């Protein structure tokens with residue numbers, strides 16, 4: 001299953017290298033041709049990065065799930081980028097993790113995506 005991601009300061013990028021899954025960095029040109037899972041980070045006050053918003057405006061029909069990187073010091077806005085995307089596009093939240101994730105977060109993501117890919 002293809003993973004589309006974005007990363008400003010490298011934490012999500014670190015996570016997706018731990019996955020060893022097919023992965024593509026999103027861009028404004030990018031048109032994805034197959035089902036994919038998004039991994040986004042979370043911007044101030046529970047928000048979705050603009051580059052991700054722009055990409056999803058164009059690519060949401062192939063979106064099958066979303067995970068967010070965030071930080072629990074944001075309390076109930078932790079990972080709320082995923083809550084927004086999930087609600088808007090009616091796709092599951094695969095997972096939430098902090099920063100570049102733990103090994104357990106990596107494993108958990110892959111297990112959940114295997115389920116959704118069925």
Ligand SMILES: Cc1cc2nc3c(=O)[nH]c(=O)nc-3n(C[C@H](O)[C@H](O)[C@H](O)COP(=O)(O)O)c2cc1C
Pocket residue numbers: 006007008009010011012013041042043044045046047069070071072074077078079080098099100
């Ligand atoms: C200014 C700023 C605001 C943030 N806002 C939130 C937030 O509302 N919720 C959250 O869970 N994480 C928040 N984060 C944490 C980032 O989402 C987290 O560091 C993430 O791992 C960054 O991913 P990246 O390194 O791939 O850009 C914020 C970080 C910064 C610098």
Ligand SMILES: C[As](C)(=O)[O-]
Pocket residue numbers: 023024025
């Ligand atoms: C987005 As890449 C080439 O570092 O896997």
Ligand SMILES: [Zn+2]
Pocket residue numbers: 017
């Ligand atoms: Zn790389």
